[PDB]
């Protein structure tokens, strides 16, 4: 718990400087100390996304979701994990899948950023 979060935060610091190796490693240590926290897994998903590895990001988002449905109290992080899957489709121009996943996210927790990203995709899709 305590050290887990100090591991996550060093990872966070690394990720923000695009030091993805270091982020992943600190995220791993965080996950070994507290396997039931889906945030570390969604954090790794973010790393793979910024690497261009959209597929791994989605895989990791899916795992984060199974861990969170077990917690049962984590609707907002579940929401984040779906919107990250949406984002990863959006990046590949797979807009129908992007939109579907934003709707999943919003249904969990409505947020403005995710609503705005959804409307962007709906407009692109409309006008195609």
């Amino acid at each position: 718990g305590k050290q887990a979060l100090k591991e996550k935060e060093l990872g966070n610091d690394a990720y923000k400087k695009k030091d993805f190796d270091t982020a992943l490693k600190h995220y791993d240590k965080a996950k070994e100390l507290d396997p039931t926290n889906m945030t570390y897994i969604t954090n790794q998903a973010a790393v793979y996304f910024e690497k261009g590895d959209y597929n791994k990001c989605r895989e990791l988002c899916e795992k984060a979701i199974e861990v969170g449905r077990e917690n049962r109290e984590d609707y907002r992080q579940i929401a984040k994990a779906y919107a990250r899957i949406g984002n990863s489709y959006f990046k590949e121009e797979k807009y129908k899948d992007a939109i579907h996943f934003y709707n999943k996210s919003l249904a969990e927790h409505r947020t403005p950023d995710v609503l705005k990203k959804c409307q962007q995709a709906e407009k692109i899709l409309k006008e195609q």
Partner: peptide, 8 residues
């Protein structure tokens, strides 16, 4: 330019 995915 490009927005970065946010870490928690």
């Amino acid at each position: 330019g490009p927005t970065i995915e946010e870490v928690d």
